[PDB]
Ligand binder design. Structure first.
Ligand code: HEM
Ligand SMILES: O=C(CCCCn1ccnc1)N[C@@H](Cc1ccccc1)C(=O)O
Length: 454
């Protein structure tokens, strides 16, 4: 079968289709029009966007396909280096860092991070308790304050103190501006035009800021000798069982940069979309709030109580279904192979997995695919293989999944325990795209139930 291809622009092929404010949503509309697979070409590049569980279940076979760096991840590698997300599977530092960090990211490790997550969650709740009557909440903004502070504290015992400020931390200014340059660079029809020389000088300056600040975090910790129970201590002290080697300081810096990207708007986006869907679905909100009140019987949640917030967990999975905040990942064929009995691929051929569109496969989810129904996730065994991929696939899946879900379940549970929510503007969903997704301008009012944290 010859696969379809969206409209072309002469020698720029399909590249101008990406020169839009909302490229993921544009690719979703192309998939609506063209179906489960389409070819996408740009100067020097061919890939194939997959959208059906039928084809993606094959693409997730690690004997046939391995992780590819998309152009986006190749550009992120200019500042995240051979950290875990921007490493190829065959680089020594991927498997080394993977083996060392897996124990730091397990459910067991979450028991140790729990108290630091609570510290930040209580700050969020106190901020909202302290708002004046008729004041509102800027939801993505506050969710990013919470997720950034949580990965700073659990990551390297650093307080970004995001609830004390409006202006971002200098590291975050350079990180966000670096990610903006990545997005801009993907959209340039003529990337070598001297009109972008200033952008490139700024990008290099931002790389240096991130390196300098993280290198000093690492140097300061080695100099103090402090043994806090954070990711940095584990990286300084751990040895890979396979090679017997530790990570060196440059790779530790790249991992820290990698975690800060991941724990910033990628994770806060999940909380923002979850709260959006809850306020647009009042019966779902009521059920989740009933669970929070039943389970969260103490002034601060315990680790075991967060594990008991089963419906809150289903709410988060259903938000990941509709708007997964890391919306694509890339693969390449390890050898010649045929996809779906119809599409022959050659060794090295690239695939993109378009996750929001996979999650809209009606052959899997049924006709009500746009509805927000957390009960879809009552039983993971009832979900077909590779139908639900917000955290990627296989050995290259998200190492932070348990971390992101624990922090999100904890704070959403506390939010639902402590406040009633009003969609006071009847907010119209507007999804802003960076390399992640967020409901731009999403605001609510939160009326306290006046339940103390003491
Ligand atoms: C809801 C929040 C998150 C989502 C949806 C998410 C999604 C993903 C996805 C889709 C991938 C695979 C990317 C690819 O194949 O190119 C990935 C990888 C990864 N994520 Fe996350 N992520 C989240 C939060 C986090 C957090 C909080 C951390 C750590 C602080 C983290 C650390 C990583 C790492 C290190 C990898 C690379 C794993 C490897 O290849 O060995 N992620 N994430
Ligand atoms: O595949 C990725 C990268 C997703 C990586 C997730 N991530 C990692 C760190 N922060 C976020 N983008 C997509 C969509 C896209 C297209 C053009 C411009 C921007 C985005 C693509 O190129 O098709």
């Amino acid at each position: 079968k010859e696969m379809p291809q969206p409209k072309t622009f002469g020698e720029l092929k399909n590249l101008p289709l990406l020169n839009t404010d909302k490229p993921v949503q544009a690719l979703m509309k192309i998939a609506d029009e063209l179906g489960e697979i389409f070819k996408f070409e740009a100067p020097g590049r061919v890939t194939r966007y997959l959208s059906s569980q039928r084809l993606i279940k094959e693409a997730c076979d690690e004997s046939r396909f391995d992780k590819n760096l998309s152009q986006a991840l190749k550009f992120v590698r200019d500042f995240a280096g051979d950290g875990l997300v921007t490493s190829w599977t065959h680089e020594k530092n991927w498997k080394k860092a993977h083996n060392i960090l897996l124990p730091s990211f397990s459910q067991q490790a979450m028991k140790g991070y729990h108290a630091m997550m609570v510290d930040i969650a209580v700050q969020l709740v106190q901020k909202w308790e302290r708002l004046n009557a008729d004041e509102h909440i800027e939801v993505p903004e506050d969710m990013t304050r919470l997720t950034l502070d949580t990965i700073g504290l659990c990551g390297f015992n650093y307080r970004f103190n995001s609830f004390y400020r409006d202006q971002p931390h200098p590291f975050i200014t350079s990180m966000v501006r670096a990610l903006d340059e990545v997005m801009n660079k993907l959209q340039r029809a003529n990337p070598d035009d001297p009109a972008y020389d200033e952008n490139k000088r700024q990008f290099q300056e931002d790389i240096k800021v991130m390196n300098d600040l993280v290198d000093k975090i690492i140097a300061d910790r080695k100099a103090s000798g402090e043994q806090s129970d954070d990711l940095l201590t584990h990286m300084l002290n751990g040895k890979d069982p396979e090679t017997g080697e530790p990570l060196d300081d440059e790779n530790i810096r790249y991992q820290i940069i990698t975690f800060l990207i991941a724990g910033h708007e990628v994770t806060s986006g999940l909380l923002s979309f979850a709260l959006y869907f809850l306020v647009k679905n009042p019966h779902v909100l009521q059920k989740a709030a009933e669970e929070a009140a039943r389970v969260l019987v103490d002034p601060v949640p315990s680790y075991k109580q967060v594990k008991q917030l089963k419906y809150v967990g289903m709410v988060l999975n259903e938000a990941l279904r509709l708007w997964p905040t890391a919306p694509a990942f890339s693969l390449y064929a390890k050898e010649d192979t045929v996809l779906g009995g119809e599409y022959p691929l050659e060794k090295g051929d690239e695939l993109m997995v378009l996750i929001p569109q996979l999650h809209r496969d009606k052959t899997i989810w049924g006709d009500d695919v746009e509805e927000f129904r957390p009960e879809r996730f009552e039983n993971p065994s009832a979900i077909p293989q590779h139908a639900f991929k917000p955290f990627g696939n296989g050995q290259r899946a998200c190492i932070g999944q348990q971390f992101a879900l624990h922090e999100a379940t904890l704070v959403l549970g506390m939010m639902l325990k402590h406040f009633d929510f009003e969609d006071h503007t009847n907010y119209e969903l507007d999804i802003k795209e960076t390399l992640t997704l967020k409901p731009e301008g999403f605001v609510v009012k939160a009326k306290s139930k006046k339940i103390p944290l003491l």
